[PDB]
Amino acid sequence: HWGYGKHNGPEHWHKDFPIAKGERQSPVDIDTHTAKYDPSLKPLSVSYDQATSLRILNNGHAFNVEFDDSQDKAVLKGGPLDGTYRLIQFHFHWGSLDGQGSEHTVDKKKYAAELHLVHWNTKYGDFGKAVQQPDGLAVLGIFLKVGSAKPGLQKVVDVLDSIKTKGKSADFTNFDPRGLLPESLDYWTYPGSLTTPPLLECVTWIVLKEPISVSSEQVLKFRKLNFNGEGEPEELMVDNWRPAQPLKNRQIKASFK
Numbered sequence: 001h002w003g004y005g006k007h008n009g010p011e012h013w014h015k016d017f018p019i020a021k022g023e024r025q026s027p028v029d030i031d032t033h034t035a036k037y038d039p040s041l042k043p044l045s046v047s048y049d050q051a052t053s054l055r056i057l058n059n060g061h062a063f064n065v066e067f068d069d070s071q072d073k074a075v076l077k078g079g080p081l082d083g084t085y086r087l088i089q090f091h092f093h094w095g096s097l098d099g100q101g102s103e104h105t106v107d108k109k110k111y112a113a114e115l116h117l118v119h120w121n122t123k124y125g126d127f128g129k130a131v132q133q134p135d136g137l138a139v140l141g142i143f144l145k146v147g148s149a150k151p152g153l154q155k156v157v158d159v160l161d162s163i164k165t166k167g168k169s170a171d172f173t174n175f176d177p178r179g180l181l182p183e184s185l186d187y188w189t190y191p192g193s194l195t196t197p198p199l200l201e202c203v204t205w206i207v208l209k210e211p212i213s214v215s216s217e218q219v220l221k222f223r224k225l226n227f228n229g230e231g232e233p234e235e236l237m238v239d240n241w242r243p244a245q246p247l248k249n250r251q252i253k254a255s256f257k
């Protein structure tokens, strides 16, 4: 099945998921000089005050922090979006080395990791119906660079040892995702896709310009996770990023001059 190795990595995914070579795949390189400022964009509204985390799961590809999305609680609106999108989970992509790991790149620059906060358009009722729609999802993407620690990340780092291997989950209540956000909400936006199979073309991507800093020790702990299940030969969960895909007939808009 799919993964990030030589035999089942991104260059193979198109055989099971032909949309891998579609018209609006993600990630992409953000060419800052070519992204035009769009003064009709609204500021982004991130309202995470009532977010309710439930659990953290090692899915064999990444770890997901999952939210109760049964009520209207943690929503993204404004920016390029029409209507209200509800937070359902976040996860990260990261490298084996600090010089790589992000999926989007900025003028070809790779960051050490990238956080994806996934939200679904509440006009479609739930996540499963939203991923059948071209405007079903909005993913807030945030780059990580290695430097000072991010205090708001530590509770996630500290729980990873309890979900080392594929299929493990742990209670993860009362986690506040506001602690993972940078100061500025300046962003680039474009239409794209999930960056993992099934690679569905549902996503309005909103990529923040300002990275957050995490410490070398924090990202080292992400790299101790495993892609394998318990009892299987250890394969470290590193380099779970898809490289940039062709922009095709898309424009990337900037919210800032």
Ligand SMILES: On1ccc2ccccc2c1=S
Pocket: 116, 118, 137, 139, 193, 194, 195, 196, 203
């Ligand atoms: O990586 N990843 C995994 C699951 C998912 C689900 C909805 C939207 C985006 C994603 C991504 S980027």
Ligand SMILES: [Zn+2]
Pocket: 091, 092, 093, 116, 195, 196
């Ligand atoms: Zn992702």
